[PDB]
Amino acid sequence: ITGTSTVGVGRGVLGDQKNINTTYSTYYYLQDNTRGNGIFTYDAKYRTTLPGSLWADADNQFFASYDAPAVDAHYYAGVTYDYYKNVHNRLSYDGNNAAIRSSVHYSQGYNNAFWNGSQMVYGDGDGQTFIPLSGGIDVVAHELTHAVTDYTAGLIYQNESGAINEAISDIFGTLVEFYANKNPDWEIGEDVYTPGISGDSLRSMSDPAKYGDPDHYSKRYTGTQDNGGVHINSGIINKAAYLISQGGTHYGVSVVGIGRDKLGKIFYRALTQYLTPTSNFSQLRAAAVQSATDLYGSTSQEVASVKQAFDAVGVK
Numbered sequence: 001i002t003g004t005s006t007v008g009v010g011r012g013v014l015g016d017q018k019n020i021n022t023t024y025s026t027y028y029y030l031q032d033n034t035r036g037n038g039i040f041t042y043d044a045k046y047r048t049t050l051p052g053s054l055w056a057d058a059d060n061q062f063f064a065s066y067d068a069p070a071v072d073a074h075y076y077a078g079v080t081y082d083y084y085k086n087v088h089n090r091l092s093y094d095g096n097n098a099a100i101r102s103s104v105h106y107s108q109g110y111n112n113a114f115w116n117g118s119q120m121v122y123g124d125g126d127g128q129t130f131i132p133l134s135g136g137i138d139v140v141a142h143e144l145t146h147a148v149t150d151y152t153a154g155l156i157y158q159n160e161s162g163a164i165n166e167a168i169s170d171i172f173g174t175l176v177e178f179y180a181n182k183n184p185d186w187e188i189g190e191d192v193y194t195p196g197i198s199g200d201s202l203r204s205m206s207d208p209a210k211y212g213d214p215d216h217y218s219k220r221y222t223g224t225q226d227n228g229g230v231h232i233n234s235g236i237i238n239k240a241a242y243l244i245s246q247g248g249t250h251y252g253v254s255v256v257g258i259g260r261d262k263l264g265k266i267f268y269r270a271l272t273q274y275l276t277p278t279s280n281f282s283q284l285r286a287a288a289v290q291s292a293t294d295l296y297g298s299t300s301q302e303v304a305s306v307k308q309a310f311d312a313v314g315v316k
Ligand SMILES: O[C@@H]1[C@@H](O)[C@@H](O)OC[C@H]1O
Pocket: 049, 052, 053, 054
């Protein structure tokens, strides 16, 4: 919509106050003109028609319970945009400043959130398995990272390539969570999963086995469920990424940690320059080693740590 750029205030799903960029034309709309070709947040009104109505508010104050999923979808899309632009010099998910559109209140009791190829879609959850999923910055950034993947390597969503696709989204979802630096961790979805249970998550990057996911190539799932285990076998790569950043000794292999910024630079370069739609785990290792070589030199600690981490998870 055409209007004045304004700054509203509201509270997100977890009750935290934040400012949001809006546009004023009779109503205040969740339209942020400060980032690329805009960030736009819509109300699906418990239906499945997309995108729905551009979110309109009478007073630029978003403190109602019904407002909270929209506040977070809008604000965390902005954080994700800022991460990719400021850290990787990438303008929106496509690198060409595409508008970021999100719809909240999708369907009823819907325990999922997804990038659908052109926008983000957030269920409100059923209140037991999930609360509204835009409350999780890692979920928001995980799904927007699928769009980055689609516009770069094009990893296919099955078998090893699909597990890499998933892990890439968990890695950058977590790096966005740290970039905000409010309540970061190496878990996925902890803010919105199981409101009645503290200390759990959908999966752990630091210890995938906590939730029964593999932490070594020898433990990879080879069945047909979950598109060949894409959210399961992601644990193998997630563990490697955790080790690259934080270090540790895993199955007797010591890894010298190089920190989060270098992890992100290495994997971003791998994704955008070297991976292809059918890259397997071994090819990801090669891409990460080559990326670290490009950035830091073949004799660098960074290259050595990449190799150690993939060794530790059994990926040669
Ligand atoms: O679905 C509708 C959308 O197309 C637009 O017109 O904004 C209002 C919504 O009701």
